[PDB]
Scaffold this motif. Structure first.
Motif, mmCIF file in Angstrom:
data_model
loop_
_atom_site.group_PDB
_atom_site.id
_atom_site.type_symbol
_atom_site.label_atom_id
_atom_site.label_comp_id
_atom_site.label_asym_id
_atom_site.label_seq_id
_atom_site.Cartn_x
_atom_site.Cartn_y
_atom_site.Cartn_z
ATOM 1 N N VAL A 17 31.161 66.237 9.751
ATOM 2 C CA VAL A 17 31.939 67.257 10.299
ATOM 3 C C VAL A 17 33.252 67.330 9.905
ATOM 4 O O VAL A 17 34.029 68.173 9.795
ATOM 5 C CB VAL A 17 31.702 67.471 11.828
ATOM 6 N N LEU A 18 34.002 66.150 10.263
ATOM 7 C CA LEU A 18 35.397 65.770 10.095
ATOM 8 C C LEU A 18 35.618 66.091 8.554
ATOM 9 O O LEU A 18 36.726 66.650 8.464
ATOM 10 C CB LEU A 18 35.831 64.634 10.746
ATOM 11 N N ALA A 19 34.968 65.531 7.949
ATOM 12 C CA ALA A 19 35.154 65.536 6.272
ATOM 13 C C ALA A 19 34.991 67.122 5.780
ATOM 14 O O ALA A 19 35.919 67.667 5.185
ATOM 15 C CB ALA A 19 34.379 64.840 5.345
ATOM 16 N N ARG A 20 34.189 67.986 6.476
ATOM 17 C CA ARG A 20 34.099 69.207 6.031
ATOM 18 C C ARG A 20 35.204 69.915 6.671
ATOM 19 O O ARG A 20 35.809 70.984 5.998
ATOM 20 C CB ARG A 20 32.702 69.900 6.692
ATOM 21 N N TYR A 21 35.874 69.641 7.576
ATOM 22 C CA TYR A 21 36.980 70.350 8.230
ATOM 23 C C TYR A 21 38.090 69.997 7.401
ATOM 24 O O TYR A 21 38.900 71.037 7.221
ATOM 25 C CB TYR A 21 37.238 70.017 9.616
ATOM 26 N N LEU A 22 38.587 68.733 7.050
ATOM 27 C CA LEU A 22 39.295 68.298 6.014
ATOM 28 C C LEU A 22 39.208 68.759 4.707
ATOM 29 O O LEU A 22 40.187 68.530 3.940
ATOM 30 C CB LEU A 22 39.517 66.834 6.053
ATOM 31 N N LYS A 23 38.009 69.377 4.352
ATOM 32 C CA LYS A 23 37.704 69.865 2.891
ATOM 33 C C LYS A 23 37.978 68.560 2.097
ATOM 34 O O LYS A 23 38.308 68.400 1.000
ATOM 35 C CB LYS A 23 38.776 70.910 2.567
ATOM 36 N N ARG B 1 41.866 63.400 9.847
ATOM 37 C CA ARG B 1 41.782 61.901 8.930
ATOM 38 C C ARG B 1 41.409 60.493 9.693
ATOM 39 O O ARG B 1 40.721 59.595 9.618
ATOM 40 C CB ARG B 1 42.898 61.905 8.027
ATOM 41 N N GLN B 2 42.339 60.549 10.795
ATOM 42 C CA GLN B 2 42.229 59.208 11.598
ATOM 43 C C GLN B 2 40.997 58.909 12.268
ATOM 44 O O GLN B 2 40.283 57.987 11.998
ATOM 45 C CB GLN B 2 43.400 59.165 12.582
ATOM 46 N N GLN B 3 40.405 60.260 12.808
ATOM 47 C CA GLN B 3 39.125 60.065 13.284
ATOM 48 C C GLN B 3 37.930 60.018 12.402
ATOM 49 O O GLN B 3 36.880 59.176 12.675
ATOM 50 C CB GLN B 3 38.642 61.349 14.114
ATOM 51 N N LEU B 4 38.147 60.386 11.147
ATOM 52 C CA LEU B 4 37.229 60.198 9.976
ATOM 53 C C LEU B 4 37.126 58.969 9.577
ATOM 54 O O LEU B 4 36.190 58.217 9.357
ATOM 55 C CB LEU B 4 37.365 61.164 9.152
ATOM 56 N N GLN B 5 38.442 58.127 9.459
ATOM 57 C CA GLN B 5 38.535 56.854 9.096
ATOM 58 C C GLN B 5 37.885 55.920 10.226
ATOM 59 O O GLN B 5 37.293 54.899 9.803
ATOM 60 C CB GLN B 5 40.158 56.280 8.747
ATOM 61 N N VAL B 6 38.042 56.155 11.554
ATOM 62 C CA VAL B 6 37.394 55.390 12.496
ATOM 63 C C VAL B 6 36.062 55.388 12.355
ATOM 64 O O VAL B 6 35.319 54.476 12.516
ATOM 65 C CB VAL B 6 37.920 55.945 14.020
ATOM 66 N N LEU B 7 35.316 56.594 12.337
ATOM 67 C CA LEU B 7 33.948 56.718 12.044
ATOM 68 C C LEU B 7 33.450 56.160 10.906
ATOM 69 O O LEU B 7 32.193 55.462 11.082
ATOM 70 C CB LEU B 7 33.572 58.256 12.014
ATOM 71 N N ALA B 8 34.189 56.110 9.734
ATOM 72 C CA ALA B 8 33.949 55.330 8.422
ATOM 73 C C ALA B 8 33.739 53.998 8.757
ATOM 74 O O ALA B 8 32.876 52.931 8.370
ATOM 75 C CB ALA B 8 34.616 55.854 7.316
#
Lengths: 108, 49, 11, 49
Positions: A17-23, B1-8
């Motif tokens: 979901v976050l990647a999709r939001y960030l494109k 981006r920070q939340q994505l990095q945390v999840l990764a």
């Protein structure tokens, strides 16, 4: 490990979901890698064709060996003349050369 | 981006792994192509073709 | 408690 | 919205369950009211009242 699997699934979904939001394209790197791997495969196929054709010896032996920086010049005959003279002089004095043989004539 | 990095990081996921593999394969493409251009400069376009 | 520790670290 | 949907899926939560039950009960109200209007058109407002 059902609960940890469920959490890993949840975290993956939130990440997507976050990647999709960030494109952000998570698979873009893998796509580029696969294309480049195909390119490596076809270039290697060309190289193996040329190797089966010309041969290992020919391909290895056509390797370039010349470079201008690697040339060695020798012009100090003015120095080597005196060096040879002293060598002959000391050899005759020490008794290496008792007679004027063809090697002494050549050095002369 | 920070939340994505945390999840990764929690998932033990390497977002840069694909890019690293791509750069390695790009270097491999470059060196194989260098070999091919050397063979072309040696034998020639007509011979190789 | 490795899994709960991992969740606590994530949170 | 996407994060909420992810959390609902993880929780096995049906956000549309209430709406589905509401639409079912609305259809039930419609058919019972159809029966009542038939009986009213039949016996009449005066008789039913």
């Amino acid at each position: 490990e059902e609960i940890t699997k469920d959490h890993k699934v949840l975290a993956r979904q939130q990440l997507q979901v976050l990647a999709r939001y960030l494109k952000m394209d998570l698979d873009n790197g893998e796509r580029k890698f696969l294309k480049e791997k195909d390119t490596v495969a076809e270039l290697q196929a060309q190289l193996d064709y040329l190797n089966a054709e010309l041969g290992e010896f020919f391909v290895n032996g056509v390797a370039t060996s010349f470079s201008r920086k690697k040339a060695r010049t020798f012009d100090s005959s003015w120095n080597w003349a005196k060096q040879s003279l002293l060598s002959l002089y000391f050899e005759i004095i020490h008794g290496v050369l008792k007679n004027v043989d063809r090697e002494v004539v050549s050095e002369a």
